[PDB]
Design a protein around this nucleic acid. Sequence first.
RNA 1: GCGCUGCUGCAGUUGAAACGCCCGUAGUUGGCCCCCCGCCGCCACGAGGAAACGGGAGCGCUCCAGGCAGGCCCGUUGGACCCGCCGCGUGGGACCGCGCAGCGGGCGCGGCGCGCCGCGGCAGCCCCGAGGAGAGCGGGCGGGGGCACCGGUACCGGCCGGGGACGGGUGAAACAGGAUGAUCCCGCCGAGACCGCCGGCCGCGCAGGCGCCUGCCAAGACCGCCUCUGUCAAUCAAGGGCGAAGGCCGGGGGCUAGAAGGCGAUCAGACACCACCGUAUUCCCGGCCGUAAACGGUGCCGCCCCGCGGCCGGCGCGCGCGUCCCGCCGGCCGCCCAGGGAAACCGGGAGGCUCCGGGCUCUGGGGGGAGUAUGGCCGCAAGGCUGAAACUUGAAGGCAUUG
Lengths: 65, 153, 129, 96, 138
Amino acid sequence: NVDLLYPDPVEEQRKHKLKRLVQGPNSYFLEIKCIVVVYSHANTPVFCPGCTSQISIPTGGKCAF
Amino acid sequence: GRMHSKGKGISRSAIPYTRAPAPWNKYTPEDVCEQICKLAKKGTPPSRIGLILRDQFAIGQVKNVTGSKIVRILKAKGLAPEIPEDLYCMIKKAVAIRKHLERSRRDKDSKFRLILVESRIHRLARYYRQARRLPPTFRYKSDQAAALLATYA
Amino acid sequence: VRINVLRDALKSICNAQRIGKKQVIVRPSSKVIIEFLQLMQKNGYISDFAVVDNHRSNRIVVNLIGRLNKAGVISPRFDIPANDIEKWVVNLLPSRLFGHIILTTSQGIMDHIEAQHRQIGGKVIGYFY
Amino acid sequence: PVKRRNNGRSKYNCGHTNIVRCQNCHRCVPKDKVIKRFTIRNIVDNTIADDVLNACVIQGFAIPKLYNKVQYCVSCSIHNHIVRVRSREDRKIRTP
Amino acid sequence: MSKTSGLYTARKLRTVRRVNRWADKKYRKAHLGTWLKANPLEGACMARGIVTQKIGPNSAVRKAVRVQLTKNSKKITAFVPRDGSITYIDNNDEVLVAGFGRAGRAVGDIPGCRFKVIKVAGIGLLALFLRKREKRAR
RNA sequence: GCGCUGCUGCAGUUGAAACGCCCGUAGUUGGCCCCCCGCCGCCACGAGGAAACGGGAGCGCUCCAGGCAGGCCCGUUGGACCCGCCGCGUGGGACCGCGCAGCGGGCGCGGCGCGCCGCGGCAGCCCCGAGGAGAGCGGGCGGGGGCACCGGUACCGGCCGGGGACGGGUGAAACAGGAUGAUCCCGCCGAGACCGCCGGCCGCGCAGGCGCCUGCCAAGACCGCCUCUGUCAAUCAAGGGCGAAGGCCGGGGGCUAGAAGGCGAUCAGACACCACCGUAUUCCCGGCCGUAAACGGUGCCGCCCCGCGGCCGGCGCGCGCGUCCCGCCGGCCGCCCAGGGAAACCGGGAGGCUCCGGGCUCUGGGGGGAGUAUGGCCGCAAGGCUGAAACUUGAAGGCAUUG
Ligand SMILES: CC[C@H]1CN2CCc3cc(OC)c(OC)cc3[C@@H]2C[C@@H]1C[C@H]1NCCc2cc(OC)c(OC)cc21
Ligand SMILES: [Mg+2]
Ligand SMILES: [Mg+2]
Ligand SMILES: [Mg+2]
Ligand SMILES: [Mg+2]
Ligand SMILES: [Mg+2]
Ligand SMILES: [Mg+2]
Ligand SMILES: [Mg+2]
Ligand SMILES: [Mg+2]
Ligand SMILES: [Mg+2]
Ligand SMILES: [Mg+2]
Ligand SMILES: [Zn+2]
C-alpha cells in the first residue's frame, strides 16, 4: 500500500527539507503588478520602477508587500 | 553552534538538484560579470553581493550561469581582498570586544568570549597559512590588530 | 563525528529486521557498502536494493525477507594470513557449515571460502549470518 | 537506593534557586522544595458575621477577607499533618 | 569506546597495562621487593636456627618457641604442632624451621605465629613422634 | 585455576571507581567522490642464511624411554622435508595515505638535459557543495553579563505630642525594660541592608549561578534563506582561564542576624538543645586561597529506535479567523510496549553486548593501616596537588524477603 521509493507528493510536503528523500528549496519566485518577479523570502529592500520607495516589509519568514 | 558551545541546530540552505538557469533568464555571464565589479568597487563583501543578486536581480545561484563562483571571478579580475572575509569579520568582533573591555574591566563573560574568538582566529589563520592563501609571515597579535584591519581593508 | 558508515548501516538494518519491516533507508552510499550488499544479495539475505542520487552522499534503499540473524563490522581492519583463518572462523561464526566472513584482498572483495580456495589472505571487513 | 525520581523537589533546567524561610521554625529552605498552601478567610469568623453586619452602619458593607501564603518545611508539615506518609504505590498520585 | 582501539596504539596499551598491573596485592607482594627484604626467611624453603625459650572461641594454648636464625640474627616464633613434642625440644637445641601452608600470613587460630618446627638435632619430628628413630644422642 | 590485569576479553547510577567547568599543544582518530601513473603499508611466492631441541617420512634396540640404523638380489640402500628474519627480489594492487610547478612537435647529434621556435597540434588548465564546520542577512526570545541612576515598605535608633502601669519572653518560667512615664497610637528625622505576594515538572547561562525604576555598552543560542568558504573537524597529558559558602591581606562603611564570649533556665551533671546581650563576619573596592552530597552520585562526539501527552521559542499550511488545528526544527519534562539488569529501576538509555570490535580521555582491583609518614611543587597563612610501606584481618559491602 505504501512504498518509500515513491513517496506521496503531498505527504512529503509536511516534512523537513533535509530529511526528504531529495533535498530541495522551500522558496520560489512570484510575479507582482504595481510585471516584476520577486523572491518569496525577501529580506533586503526592493524597489519598483514607477515606485518612489520600498514596497517590501521584511519578516522572519515570508515577506509582505 | 558546536565547536565552542553545546547547542546543535540545523538551519541551512538546500540548493536545487538541477544546475540549469531559469527559463526566464535574460543575462549572459557578461552582464553579471561587470555587475560584480561595480559592487566590488563599492567595497561590498561577496555574501552581500550574492544577497543583492538574488533579491534584486532574481539570480538564485551565480555558478549555474557563469560557471564560476564570485570570489574566483574577483580574483581573475584582480579585485579579491588579501584577507578572506570571514577572518576579517572575526578580527572585527575581537576588536570590538577588546574596546568594550578597555572601557570597563569587571565583565568576565566578555573575556570568555574573547578567549573563544581568539582560539577560532588562530585555528583559521593557521589553516589559511597552509594552502598558501596568506603569507607565512602573517601573524595575528592583540595589540596591533586594528592596524592590520584598516590597512588591509 | 560520523566515521564508520558501514557500522551504522548494518545496525539500522538489523534493528529494522528485528521488528520485521520490509524497507530501510541508509544515508551513506559508499562502494564498500555496495559490495557488502551485493554479497548479501547473492547469498540470499536481503534481495533487492536501489541507490538514490542527490549529489550529496546518495541514499540507498534495501528490502528485507527475514533470514538474517546478525551482521557486524571489525572496526580496525586486521591482516589475515591465508593460513590463519580457522581461528577467526571459530571465534566469530556459530558453525563451520554456514556463515560468510568478508575479506578485502588485492583480488577484490570476497568471502573466506573463496580466499581459502585460492590460498590467499588479506584484511577483514565484517561478517553476517 | 533512590526513593523518588524528582529527588524530593521540583528543580528543572537550573542549578540554583532562591531560598525562603519556614513560617513556624524559621528554617531556610529552597523555594522548589518548600510546601505551599494558599488560603482565603474572613477576618471575623463565621459565627459572629451576622452580629457584625447588624452592628455595622454602612449599607451593603462587604466583609473583607485575608489573603496569605503559608510556607512550611518538610519536618513541620509532617508534624502538623499538612502531608501524610503514603504507601509505595500511592506516592505516584498527584491530585489534591 | 572506553578503551583505545586504533591501529597505531600499542604503545599506550603497553604503558597502561604496565601502570595498572601494580594494583594487585599478590603481584605487588611478589615483584615489589619489600616482602623479600622483610621476610626473615629470605625466600628460602626453610631455615636452620637456635631455640632460646619455650612458651605456649577455642581457649586452647598452643605450644611454640622463640628462635634466632643463624644467618639473619632476627627473632621469630615457630610453633611445634605434633603432640608431646614440647618435651622433645630442649633449650638451646639446633632446629630447622619451615612455613605453614599460607605463605606470610598466620594460619588457624594461633595469633602471631607463622612457622613450624620439623627437625631437632637432625631428626625429623614425624620420624620421632612415631618412634621410628630416637634422640639418645641429645 | 583467573574473563581477579581483560588485545581476543573486566568494571565505572546505588557494590571500589567519570577530573567542578571551559580553552588547548604534543598524541590518537578523521565524511563522500576520479577504473588503470609513482611511492608506504598490506598479501602471496622466492632467494639467502648453523646444527641440536620441536614437528615429521622410514627402520620390531625382545617392547619402551631411545638411536639412525639395517638386509640381502638394497633408489647410487637410507638418513626426506619444515621451523630462529621487523632486512632483499617478483607479482597483485582491493583497502590504507601522499603527488604545488601544462602537454605535443621542429632546431637537436643515439638518448637525457639547458634553451630558441607556430600555437599551426589539445575540449589546454575549477567533481559536487556532506540532516560536518565556520562566516553573513532578517526575526523576534530570555531572573544571560557590566556600568551609572533609582522607589518601597520593614528591622533599628532619636525626637514632638497623648495616656497612665505594667511590658517582654516561654511548654512553663527567669535574666535584661519601666513614675528619668515604659509598652501602645501618630508624625518627622538618619543610616545601612533587601527586592516580596506575581514566582512556575516557565526561562537564561560553560559551569559556579541569575528577580526594584530608568538609561547606556558589548554578547549569545535558535529559527527562516536556491547568501559566502571549501574539510578549515572530534577528543585530549603539559599549559592557561573561571570557579558557592566559609577564610586571609590592605582600605571603607557599622542595620539586621550572629561563630567566640557572657548570662537565665532544664538536668544527676548540661560549659548543648530553649530565652536574652553580643565581637569577628555578613555589605563595597583591589588582591589571595582553589575547595563542596561542586549530584542527574550517570564523561565528550556520532547513528537506529513502540506509542501517548504537557510546556517554551521560531516558521509554515488550512479554514468557518480563533491568539483555532495540522505539521517542521530546537529545548525542558511525565508514563510506558519491547529490550536490558543482582535487583531497585532505565527506556530523549542504564537498549542495539558472552550472538560479547564507531572514535578520544580519565579512574578502579577484598577490608584496615591511610589520604598517614617521607620527599617535591604551589600558598602570607589556613592548607591544596602528588602520594608508600611494614603490620593486621575473614569478612566489609549492594538490592531485595519474612519477622
Ligand atoms: C528531658 C528534657 C525535656 C523535658 N523538659 C522540662 C519539662 C518540659 C515540659 C513540657 O510541657 C509538658 C515541655 O513541652 C513539650 C517541654 C519540657 C522540657 C523539654 C525537654 C526536651 C526538649 N527536647 C526534646 C523533646 C522536646 C519536645 C518538645 O515538644 C515540642 C519540647 O517543647 C518545646 C521540648 C523538648
Ligand atoms: Mg572541541
Ligand atoms: Mg549536528
Ligand atoms: Mg532510607
Ligand atoms: Mg547545585
Ligand atoms: Mg561506589
Ligand atoms: Mg566570603
Ligand atoms: Mg563525582
Ligand atoms: Mg566487550
Ligand atoms: Mg573485579
Ligand atoms: Mg585494598
Ligand atoms: Zn515553621
